[PDB]
Symmetry: C6
Subunit: 193 residues, 6 copies
């Protein structure tokens, strides 16, 4: 997809942020969005097309693929990016609002609170998405999925496409998110000092 | 699709709008257009291709898919975006017209009325599209669709692609639209004060 | 497709036009080109691929699809856009020519005539395309097409893809074109006064 | 394909050209490149995929499609555009060369000759491509192609995809090219006066 | 593919080059890259998909297609473009280096040598790629390919997609490369004088 | 994929780097990213679709393709590019930080250390990816892959798509990486002097 607008706003943010914050935005762009667009999206391109179940029951493949993957990982990661970005948008909006107010007439006591809260919310969203991914899928995609969802007769064997590659990228994204967390915590500590 | 032109005009609007209004435009861009383009459009990509009916009647799949999905959700959402955007275009056009008039020779009594009416119309279109979606599809896509449309013999079983993921995104868009409504109402209240 | 160049010229026109004219160009961009690119083109994407005829005669599907859809609606609409845009290009060219002439050495008596004629021609092309669409396809796409074109033996039953959605968008475009006509007529009246 | 670079150069040309010449470049952009990119290329998208021959001889479809369409119309039109554009590039290069020469130290006697010759060559290339198209394909694509090319046993019947639509666009392009010719001739006459 | 970056650098080169050199870069852009992107890449799009062998041996089509086309022509041409472009990059880098050196503190004796060597290397790479193409594929793609590569039993008949069109474009590219050579030689002669 | 953002940052780096460093960035752009996007990605486009195994066991093709290619080469190369680029981002960030610090109030003793370490890390990542590729795949892709992974009965024969072309590009990328190493070493030596 096209991320140009979000990139515009976030680049604008870069100016109004801590050094750790600029590192965080660089990470967001390079190791999440770029990889999604150029590496991961191709990996999941044939997720359902090459999902194959050992049966001749009509509709069994559509229901078994939907059971194994209620939301695809790539879409989960899209949502994750958007939600961890939103607070930064809030903060830069507050900043530009104060700027226009001063013109009509940096991290002051008024902004500081908003900035800290935005770091806090980035952290909360990151942790939430990581936990949700863990419970939904674990962190490994196994090649065999056994499904007993109607209309499938008894339990059928279905086989996932590219399970090892998908696992590699799952773990890669997990690590990127953990790095984001570390950065957020160090930024809170730096402000504290 | 390419939304660049609409984005140009709406970015122009951002200047001539209330703080709540700028939040609303940010929402429009990030949580509706971006998601459509990068997440939802892939979800619905194989909507008809992976729609499968248990029959060997020719033409039964084309007529049963058309019965279940008279308009696809993604196209409904496109139309929604365009129609909720139009009033903002009207208002910014009025603004630039007054600007050129003054040059030849902010929210004044002349504009205020137009602005309030444009908020009102955004609200009406949002509510209308939400209601229309509810009656057309409810808010859950079930995996099994039973169809009795000619040429299908008797009632046939057809199976939808990615029903759970489509449901997730349906609800997501519903929530985004509700947030838009709340923003519009708070903007009317703010003007009232 | 890529409409960037036409958009450049037409944006240039926006300056040299009446307020109604700027509304007309806004409509052209938002409700015709954007929709084509992001909504309609996907609807017609599988027009022939999912066109299915009840026969085992080779070549019957290629000849029956060509009979039902001699020109696809999307291409008809492309041509329509281009032809209703051309006169505006003529007028802005005349304007820039007079500008360069004056530099070497707004709606004057010389331009006024050209402007009125360009409105007239926009109107004629719009009416012509609407009428042509009516005679070629009516304004509803029915699900069943019966074809007796060689090599098909006797009359065969063919089934169209996405007939209801295609009908929705057909009517939508009809309405957009009618709005364009109303705008053109009001612009002629405004000039008359 | 991406025509951006050629568009850059030709837009640069627009300044250094006659009024008829600017009309010609506008035509080139709007009625040839835009249509190719947004209308015609989709029409020919499934040219070979939906080419079907009544046989069960392996390789018969690959050899019969190659016999009927040695070069596809869309690629012929691409080449046409490039070759009718080249002379304009030559002329603008000569112009910028004289400009730099004068700086180191409009249609003069030196340029006039080059300009006239470039018009002449545009005309020659246009006529050549039109004639070549006529002999290669006539100007109508018939639905049935009968092929006797090895490995096909005896004469086989093959059926073309979208013959009527392809015919419509063939004639459209023919008309565009004829308009280009008329423009070139009027430009020569205008210079003559 | 996206050639934007290379285009940036080469456009930068245009300033620092002979008139013949600017012609050469214009050729590179218009008659090699543009054609690849808009004409040739579609021709080779279904190269393997529509490659068909008369056999029911599994794996025979994958091994026979790989034998006939060890590297596809389009990728060969990509590499060719990149390698004939590299020396121009070297030269413009040398130029900007001397510029920065002079600022800290045209074709001089220092640059002249580098320029001549870069022309020489362009020529060598062009000749090498032309010769390599000749030995790898001749200059005509025949419709029938006979393959005896394991697992195929005995010799099997395989049929190429679009052989005549591919031949047309092969010869076209050969001619473009020969024109490049002529330009390089004339540039060396011009410098010599 | 879209590499625009990374390209922005790296172009920014070009200014703050040694001449050898600018050569290295030019290589990165032209011989790694451009080739990936325009040549290699098409080569691997049908990697799994045209992967064929001699069996009628369901799921055997999905598990045998995943065994032969746990990560596809193209994605490996993407990751490689990103990781060899990261240190340059670190260094330019340090540079801009010192710039802003000086404004509030080239290769100095403070920067020199960071620069040398960033060269060192580029080298380490390059060597690591080269070694990892060697152990994962060797440097030749053979046409036949024999797989005994459940559910396949006994050992089955699977046939790779485009093995010779993939081998050519594998070796090409190996050579590009080796050139990068040589450049890094010469840059360390140059600094040492
Ligand atoms: C279904 C439990 O079925 P199972 O365990 O047998 O399915 C096994 C997993 N299989 C369904 C994917 C096969 O129910 C679930 O697991 C629901 C898990 C919920 C995952 C998402 C949690 C919330 C994410 C919040 C993100 C936003 C925060 C800011
Ligand atoms: C800053 C961010 C950094 C985070 C980086 C995360 C990288 C994670 C790479 C590997 C994770 C999954 C490995 C796996 O899942 O392997 C299991 C599989 C045997 O599983 P089984 O079926 O026997 O049970 O292993 C096999 O045998 C088949 C061979 C698999 C080798 C895959 C090597 C991938 C190397 C990627 C390097 C990326 C560098 C950035
Ligand atoms: C058909 C009632 O058939 P059913 O209930 O048996 O079909 C069940 C639903 N299934 C047809 C999708 C299967 O008729 C309908 O429901 C028509 C429902 C109308 C939905 C759109 C309402 C207007 C939207 C206005 C948006 C613009 C405002 C600014
Ligand atoms: C500001 C905007 C925020 C709005 C966010 C809206 C998010 C809505 C997420 C979930 C809604 C549908 C859940 C569902 O439809 O589940 C039904 C299905 C059992 O249905 P059944 O066949 O047994 O009857 O559940 C299963 O068992 C299978 C497991 C399904 C787990 C799906 C978890 C998705 C988590 C998305 C998180 C997004 C964060 C932004
Ligand atoms: C064929 C009459 O056969 P039918 O009625 O049995 O076919 C029924 C319609 N079916 C052929 C689509 C199935 O002949 C026709 O209808 C020809 C209708 C002509 C449609 C276009 C008229 C001119 C458009 C001008 C646009 C430019 C103006 C500026
Ligand atoms: C400024 C521009 C505004 C112009 C807007 C034009 C909108 C036109 C929308 C509906 C037109 C076609 C409806 C139809 O063709 O329905 C026939 C079909 C029964 O036909 P039958 O087979 O029984 O005979 O209806 C059914 O039962 C199935 C349910 C069909 C419901 C479709 C609702 C679409 C709502 C779109 C809203 C767009 C808002 C902008
Ligand atoms: C083959 C005559 O076979 P046929 O008539 O039986 O094939 C009937 C036509 N079918 C081969 C397409 C089926 O030979 C020909 O017709 C060759 C015709 C040549 C067409 C191109 C002429 C030169 C274009 C120059 C453009 C550049 C100028 C600046
Ligand atoms: C400035 C540039 C302007 C140039 C415009 C060129 C437009 C050419 C349009 C029509 C040409 C081919 C018509 C045709 O080839 O028709 C033959 C076919 C019967 O052939 P048959 O199998 O009976 O023998 O006609 C039928 O019956 C089926 C119905 C066919 C109706 C097609 C109407 C297309 C209207 C396009 C309007 C474009 C406006 C710009
Ligand atoms: C700095 C540049 C270094 C260039 C180094 C090039 C080294 C080429 C080695 C080619 C070995 C072929 C051995 C051979 O022959 O085993 C194949 C059999 O025998 C045959 O089929 C006859 C094959 C004949 C191949 C002739 C290749 C000529 C390459 C000239 C390159 C000139 C560059 C300036
Ligand atoms: C295989 C000889 O088998 P064959 O003749 O029976 O195959 C007939 C040709 N078929 C393999 C394509 C079918 O061996 C060859 O021909 C190898 C030919 C080498 C082509 C490339 C030469 C070097 C390109 C250098 C470019 C870079 C310079 C700057
Ligand atoms: C500045 C750069 C300029 C370079 C231009 C290079 C143009 C090369 C065009 C034709 C070359 C291949 C012709 C061919 O390979 O024909 C063989 C085939 C009979 O072969 P066979 O199976 O009987 O043995 O001919 C047939 O019968 C079937 C008819 C084939 C006609 C193809 C006409 C193409 C015209 C392209 C014009 C391009 C203008 C720029
Ligand atoms: C599996 C050994 O099975 P095999 O040899 O029988 O499989 C033969 C190879 N086949 C699995 C591809 C078929 O285990 C392996 O080879 C794992 C090899 C690990 C490759 C990646 C190493 C680390 C990359 C680090 C990059 C980041 C540095 C900055
Ligand atoms: C600065 C960066 C420069 C690095 C350039 C690296 C270029 C590597 C090119 C060739 C490497 C693989 C050759 C091969 O893998 O060949 C094996 C195959 C016989 O293998 P077999 O099945 O008999 O055992 O050879 C055959 O017979 C079939 C014919 C294969 C000819 C392929 C020629 C490709 C020429 C590419 C030129 C690129 C120029 C930049």
């Amino acid at each position: 997809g096209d991320w140009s607008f979000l990139g515009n706003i976030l680049e604008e943010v870069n100016e109004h942020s801590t050094v750790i914050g600029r590192v965080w935005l660089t990470v967001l762009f390079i190791f999440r969005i770029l990889i999604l667009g150029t590496a991961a999206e191709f990996v999941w391109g044939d997720e359902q097309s090459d999902f194959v179940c050992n049966t001749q029951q009509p509709g069994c493949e559509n229901v078994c693929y939907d059971e194994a993957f209620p939301i695809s990982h790539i879409r989960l990661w899209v949502l994750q990016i958007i939600f961890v970005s939103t607070p930064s948008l809030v903060y830069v909006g507050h900043a530009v609002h104060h700027v226009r107010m001063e013109e009509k007439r940096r991290l002051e006591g008024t902004l500081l609170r908003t900035y800290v809260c935005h770091i806090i919310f980035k952290t909360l969203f990151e942790v939430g998405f990581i936990v949700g991914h863990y419970f939904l899928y674990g962190f490994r995609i196994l090649p065999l999925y056994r499904c007993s969802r109607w209309p499938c007769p008894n339990v059928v064997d279905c086989f996932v496409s590219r399970p090892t590659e998908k696992t590699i990228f799952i773990l890669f994204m997990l690590s990127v998110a953990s790095v984001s967390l570390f950065l957020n915590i160090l930024e809170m500590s730096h402000l504290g000092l």
